[PDB]
Amino acid sequence: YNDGYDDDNYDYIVKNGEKWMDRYEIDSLIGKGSFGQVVKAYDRVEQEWVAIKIIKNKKAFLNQAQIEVRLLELMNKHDTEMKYYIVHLKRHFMFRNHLCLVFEMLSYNLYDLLRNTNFRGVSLNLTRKFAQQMCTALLFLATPELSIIHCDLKPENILLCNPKRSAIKIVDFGSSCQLGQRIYQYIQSRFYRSPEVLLGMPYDLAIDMWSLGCILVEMHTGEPLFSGANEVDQMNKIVEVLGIPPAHILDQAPKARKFFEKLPDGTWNLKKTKKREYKPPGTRKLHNILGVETGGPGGRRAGESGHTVADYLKFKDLILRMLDYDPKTRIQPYYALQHSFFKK
Numbered sequence: 001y002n003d004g005y006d007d008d009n010y011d012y013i014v015k016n017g018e019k020w021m022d023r024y025e026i027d028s029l030i031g032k033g034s035f036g037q038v039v040k041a042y043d044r045v046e047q048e049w050v051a052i053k054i055i056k057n058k059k060a061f062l063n064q065a066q067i068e069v070r071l072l073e074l075m076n077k078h079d080t081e082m083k084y085y086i087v088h089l090k091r092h093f094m095f096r097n098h099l100c101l102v103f104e105m106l107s108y109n110l111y112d113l114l115r116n117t118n119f120r121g122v123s124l125n126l127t128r129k130f131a132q133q134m135c136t137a138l139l140f141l142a143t144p145e146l147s148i149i150h151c152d153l154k155p156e157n158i159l160l161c162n163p164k165r166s167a168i169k170i171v172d173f174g175s176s177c178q179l180g181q182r183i184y185q186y187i188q189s190r191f192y193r194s195p196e197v198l199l200g201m202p203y204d205l206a207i208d209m210w211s212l213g214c215i216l217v218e219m220h221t222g223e224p225l226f227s228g229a230n231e232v233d234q235m236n237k238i239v240e241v242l243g244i245p246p247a248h249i250l251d252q253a254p255k256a257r258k259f260f261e262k263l264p265d266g267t268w269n270l271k272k273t274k275k276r277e278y279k280p281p282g283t284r285k286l287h288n289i290l291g292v293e294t295g296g297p298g299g300r301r302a303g304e305s306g307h308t309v310a311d312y313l314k315f316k317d318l319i320l321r322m323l324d325y326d327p328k329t330r331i332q333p334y335y336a337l338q339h340s341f342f343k344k
């Protein structure tokens with residue numbers, strides 16, 4: 001495969017120590033998703049470490065990363081301090097028939113952070129800071145001459161700048177597109193996937209806000225809010241919390257009948273089944289998941305500072321505005337930043 005340079009998966013067979021182009025000194029592998037791999041490497045020419053995202057040697061994979069690069073370059077050259085919430089693409093190049101993107105090295109991602117605490121969750125204060133950054137990040141992406149949809153927000157694609165501080169950056173625009181230049185129907189990671197996408201409807205930037213909604217709850221509770229094993233499970237878990245999606249949406253949804261049934265009288269219910277598996281629609285209240293009046297998630301924050309019922313009621317209000325079923329009334333970043341959960 002690729003004159004012995006690649007494994008059977010179209011991935012470059014990384015070798016520690018290797019020096020590419022009399023410049024980069026590959027130390028090791030540090031990331032390996034569906035896109036390919038990410039390695040740690042010393043840039044001799046600039047005297048710094050970098051992360052190198054090695055794209056899979058495969059036409060569909062390369063072609064998509066070419067889109068990542070057009071969008072990364074567009075974000076990076078935009079003069080506004082908000083652009084510092086999106087990671088910096090220093091260079092790209094072809095090497096051994098792989099596209100390679102050279103990035104500033106960042107630190108652990110938010111998933112690693114959750115794991116570091118044994119999934120007890122991070123503080124409501126910390127979560128606030130992440131949320132605050134994310135919404136400013138999304139606000140940047142929403143600027144008209146950008147209008148970029150990330151499409152795969154989740155803890156693993158949000159990284160700490162430095163391991164002991166709380167500045168973060170969004171990475172992985174490998175599934176991103178601009179408004180009106182949509183090309184996939186199946187997108188986002190399942191846990192973080194919006195209802196409009198599960199329903200096969202057209203989507204806009206509001207899908208990132210759904211994802212953020214779910215992420216922030218997870219960051220605080222330490223477990224995914226909606227953890228479906230497949231699309232049918234996913235939509236049922238959402239329903240447990242928010243009830244049946246409103247009729248105006250289902251009526252225009254190609255995949256409505258993958259999960260739902262229209263009744264003679266025009267209302268919608270879940271599909272008939274053989275058999276109890278889910279809580280009744282809307283009876284798994286975000287109010288209890290978060291532990292608003294019971295000392296937070298699991299009771300784990302009972303009488304700690306920064307975790308008042310009033311903090312939680314604010315928080316909860318934001319999340320539910322983020323998980324609005326309707327993409328046209330779901331809270332957009334501008335207004336989310338004005339939310340009272342961010343007062344001082």
Ligand SMILES: COC(=O)c1ccc(Cl)c(NC(=O)c2cc3cnc(OC)nc3[nH]c2=O)c1
Pocket residue numbers: 030031033035038051053087103104105106107108159171172173
């Ligand atoms: C899919 O990932 C991407 O598109 C992407 C795009 C751009 C970047 Cl800068 C990355 N960065 C990393 O993966 C990365 C992984 C690390 C793992 N471990 C550690 O130990 C502290 N530090 C890391 N620092 C990193 O920057 C990833």
